[PDB]
Design a protein around this ligand. Sequence first.
Ligand SMILES: NC(=O)C1=CN([C@@H]2O[C@H](COP(=O)(O)OP(=O)(O)OC[C@H]3O[C@@H](n4cnc5c(N)ncnc54)[C@H](OP(=O)(O)O)[C@@H]3O)[C@@H](O)[C@H]2O)C=CC1
Ligand code: SF4
Ligand code: SF4
Ligand code: SF4
Ligand SMILES: [Zn+2]
Lengths: 43, 176, 52, 95, 63, 55, 52, 297, 156, 48, 208, 114
Amino acid sequence: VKQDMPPVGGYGPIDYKRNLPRRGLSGYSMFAVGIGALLFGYW
Amino acid sequence: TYKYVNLREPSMDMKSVTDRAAQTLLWTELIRGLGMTLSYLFREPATINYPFEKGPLSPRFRGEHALRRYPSGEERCIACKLCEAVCPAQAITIEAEPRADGSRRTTRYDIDMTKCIYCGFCQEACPVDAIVEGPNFEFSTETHEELLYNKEKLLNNGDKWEAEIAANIQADYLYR
Amino acid sequence: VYDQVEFDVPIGSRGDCYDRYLCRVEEMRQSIRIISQCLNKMPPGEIKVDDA
Amino acid sequence: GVRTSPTGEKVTHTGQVYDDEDYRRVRFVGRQKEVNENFAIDLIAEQPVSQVGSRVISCDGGGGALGHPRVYINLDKETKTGTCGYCGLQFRQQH
Amino acid sequence: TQLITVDEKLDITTLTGVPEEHIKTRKARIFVPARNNMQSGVNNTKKWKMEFDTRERWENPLM
Amino acid sequence: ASATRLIQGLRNWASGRDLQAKLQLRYQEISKRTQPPPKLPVGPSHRLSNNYYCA
Amino acid sequence: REKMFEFYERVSGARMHAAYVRPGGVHQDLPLGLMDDIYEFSKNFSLRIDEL
Amino acid sequence: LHHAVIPHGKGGRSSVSGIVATVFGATGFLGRYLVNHLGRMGSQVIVPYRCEPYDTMHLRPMGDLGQIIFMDWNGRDKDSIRRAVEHSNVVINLVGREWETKNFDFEDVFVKIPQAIAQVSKEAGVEKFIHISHLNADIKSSSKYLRNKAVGEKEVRETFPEATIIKPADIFGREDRFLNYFANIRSLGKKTVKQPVYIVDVTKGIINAIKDPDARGKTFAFVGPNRYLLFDLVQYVFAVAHRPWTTRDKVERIHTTDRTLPHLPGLEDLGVQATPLELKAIEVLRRHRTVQPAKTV
Amino acid sequence: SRGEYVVAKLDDLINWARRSSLWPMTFGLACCAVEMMHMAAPRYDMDRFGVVFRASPRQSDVMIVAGTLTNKMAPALRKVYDQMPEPRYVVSMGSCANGGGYYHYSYSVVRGCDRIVPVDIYVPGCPPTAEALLYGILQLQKKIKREKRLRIWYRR
Amino acid sequence: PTVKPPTARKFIWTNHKFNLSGTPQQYVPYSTTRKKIQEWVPPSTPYK
Amino acid sequence: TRPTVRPRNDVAHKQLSAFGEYVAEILPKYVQQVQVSCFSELEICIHPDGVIPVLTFLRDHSNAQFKSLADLTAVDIPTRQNRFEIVYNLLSLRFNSRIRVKTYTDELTPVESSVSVYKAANWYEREIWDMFGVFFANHPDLRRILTDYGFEGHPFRKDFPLSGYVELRYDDEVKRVVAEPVELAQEFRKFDLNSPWEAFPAYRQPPE
Amino acid sequence: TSVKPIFSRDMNEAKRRVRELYRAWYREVPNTVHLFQLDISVKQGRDKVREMFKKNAHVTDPRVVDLLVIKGKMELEETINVWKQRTHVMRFFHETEAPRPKDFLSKFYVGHDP
Ligand SMILES: NC(=O)C1=CN([C@@H]2O[C@H](COP(=O)(O)OP(=O)(O)OC[C@H]3O[C@@H](n4cnc5c(N)ncnc54)[C@H](OP(=O)(O)O)[C@@H]3O)[C@@H](O)[C@H]2O)C=CC1
Ligand code: SF4
Ligand code: SF4
Ligand code: SF4
Ligand SMILES: [Zn+2]
């Protein structure tokens, strides 16, 4: 018979977890960049 | 078998609390949202060019009603009144009498297109595939009484859309 | 066939609008988890009860 | 095979036409009366009667599941043909 | 005791909300429905049916 | 999938993901709109013997 | 949401009010190649929840 | 009598009243109220419109499906009138203009069009013809409106001998040009005496003239129940409105006293009770707001 | 003549201006409102036609009645229609707004919204697809395009 | 349809028409049944 | 009877029968009937005057703990003198079970309101009034909830027709939405679909 | 024949409640006329209230009149707060419908309705 069935090997894996990338610098480096920009502007 | 959403204890050490203070003093997550929207600006929009392009449809689509014919000119309906008995909205009115050659044919077949919920029970209760729901959906009118189809209008619709209705039935009838 | 699939039940902790928002988002993730199981475990056979 | 009433109105296949004294004809003024010009009785009248060499014949309208329910027609009467109840096709025994 | 005695006949016509035209000018027929002569079954004649008289039905000018 | 590599890199940087692997717009990977005819199976009561309805 | 409306109409014929699930099973079987499109949709859907 | 014109139902929206009426000038004020009263009985109405169809849109919900048939017509084209009136058993004429334009003057509106409609209806076998004239229509009057209206009334009478000619005095209503004209001027005070008549009683009298077969060939005169001086009427209008586009012909018309015609039958002979101005002036002029009643004569 | 041509071109200009900047006021009653929002989705995108999304009822041109109008709701609809500036148009979408549909014989359902407001375009379906409602909006634009207001004003 | 033409029929319209709403060629509903109750025609001769 | 027949749940049937005997033994003052259906549903038909204690017992006994009020319904059966049957559906999350409590009233007898037991009923039984005219005594705020404001009559009674007695339309003379007696363009076609042959011998009633 | 009362043990308390309801409606009517901007007078509204009260004045069962007083109180609270519109207040005044025939002859002329 011919029916709509999944393939014999099964379908591939499907991701479902939450994925936030965790990008970017730390707080210390961000604050250091801010004070560096301030010091350059003041000079 | 259960998970605890929003039961996280944040760290109280100096590094994490300085990261949090930098986040609420320099607006990190607002920049994240801005970056999301800016990245979504440079994607190709999914907008099609109607009416020059049409949305995809399946041959099971239920649109405008039509009355079919046999491939000899004889109309398929034999006035069995199954469609008007199964119609949930009572949109179908059928009156019948024997014609001059003695066949069982209808004399009145009205479908109230303002009552019909477009459910396809009539086309699945028909034993001869006389009434069908065609693929047409661009048939909006300007007057209420134009949406009150009689037998002549449905026969004209069948003669107009047979070349597509027959192909849809041929492609679909093995699933029925 | 809900007893043959595996999924998680998100449980809130404060009863506010934010926890109900997070529960509704997590239910979309769990619905994907059941969908992947239903595709790989679809059996052949008929579609209606054979009592005509 | 349409015909035209003396008031200028087309008669449908069901024989319906509006009388000259009927006011409802005012619904057709400025518009048109929609009729179907393909009459089913006229179109089935042109179909030739099929000659078969058996006592009974089976009709399903052609196409198998795309036609009507299958029926069995007796052809013992030599005076008249055996007409199908659904499709209107007629058969005749050649003996 | 929290119970009172009312010996008058029951009359709820003021509470049903039906207009009086369909109250005093209607005749209600209470009957056991007759068996359909095209069938031999008798399951439709087991309960009493109450219905009303039939008023005018006319023809729509449009359809 | 018609974007330039510079625009693709800009989108990947600003979004944070690799968007080219998971494109929401459909393409040639989808099924054909016409399909071969099927042959549907029958139920368990499609039998000629030992198939009385009272049981 | 529009892509899942195609799944309803490809299996029942109507985009929203399917009248598909009936007492005794379902009205019509899945058309050929429908579950391939469901797998293709749900494979990329975890990214769409993350953007929201 | 055809079978489709026999009355049926209970006089509701979807019933059949057996009236096929062609209302000329139904897009105005009196025509609007007449079509509204005709459609609630399930009567078939044919509306010929000269203007844009959008201006007829408010006439659409006044009846059931197919009970109102909109169609085009021209005042100088007899073929359009023949197309409009050939399937109806009553024709009502309400065509009028307070002012004359470049294309149409008073004579064309009040004489040529009513005579053409009457002649076409007579040659099409129409049973009832109603023509709405004015009460003060006199041939020797000092305004072209009243002179041409009297001439057109005479021409309608000779062309259609069984025509019901109705002469309202001065109609006040929600969309009128009588109380709204006085309220919007923010001309003077004379010794004019007038009897304003409510629009609903005019519509009821027209409907009763349709129903009653005695009214054929008569000439009614619809007047109100009270006679007011013009100064007192203007003072009452300003008092009820809390107030401390025109031409010379309108000024001459409002200075003409309403003549007394006891010989002509009125609203009381058609079973219609006349509504006084005091009960309806507040609902007419509530929209002008941001009371001692006037004395009669 | 000169004046007929001038008023014809002016009528064409105002017709294009009115029909190319339609601002709709939807009525979020029932299923058909969900299909309306699916028409406003990025695939079909009413906004590219100049038809903005969720305009205020105090500045809107066309009212789209999408859903079932009940007896408890009709005076509010009439009030909203009466407080809308001319020129105004009404589009009935779905079977409920056209003729009652499934609930035609109900005790608390107005059998068609044409009993309350005058309707220009009737969109059939239950629900009519987003393409069908877009086609009805385009047909309303064609109906506005062939307006002849200034020609009637000059001819009268 | 250039690759797979549709099946030819004698009643299929050779001239497709678009939507005719708002035009003189629109569709007007009517009853397709005939008269139900026949009325008695009085004789054309007097009883004299 | 394997493929197409619904399997039975005998252990649930035994447990529900035991709990029904338990409840009918604890409260003999108010309960009148205890039944278990073939698909394992427990119905406890009680006197109306015990509508307040019994529910409270089911809300508070450590062996019942029916803390959830799933539904509240009224059923109109005109052949009885007490034509209104009032149905409470209770859900117990602790024991994962459902119960049904049924009382009977006519049009004029009031009912003690179960707001003090279940707060959700504060809307539910109110809807019952708006659909049936069953008055609920000691209700905090009893009024209509679904019908129109000037609506006369209770629609879900079986002597109320499908279309009502009035219908709305806009009138331009009074500039208002007005109500008029109902006149349908198409009559609702009543279908007599009941076959004259008996279908279920197990539900056959004894004759007279 | 012993029944559970709703509010009143006999007819006297029911008549007292009827009196209170009529007093409240008579006090309410001018506020309804002024607030809703109706075109009717205070006399017409009070005559309408008296018309309903006399129309519904043939009952003798305490529970029925108790329920009638309850429903009248519900209508009174729907009128006290602005929940009814102008249309719901004017439902009691049937202005749009034609006056039905009363004698035998007019009903014979218009149709088959008895
Ligand atoms: N004060 C009053 O109201 C009184 C009025 N009358 C008479 O009653 C009738 C109706 O009055 P009223 O409603 O107030 O006036 P309107 O001006 O409001 O109504 C006149 C109607 O006739 C149409 N019309 C006018 N001129 C022409 C024309 N040349 N060709 C075709 N149609 C035309 C108008 O349509 P459109 O302009 O849109 O084309 C409109 O529908 C008139 O005959 C008037 O003389 C009598 C007594 C008192
Ligand atoms: S689709 Fe359904 S509602 Fe429409 S005519 Fe057919 S059976 Fe009736
Ligand atoms: S079900 Fe088919 S054959 Fe029967 S009456 Fe309807 S259209 Fe005709
Ligand atoms: S027409 Fe159909 S889809 Fe639209 S509101 Fe009515 S029931 Fe819902
Ligand atoms: Zn055959």
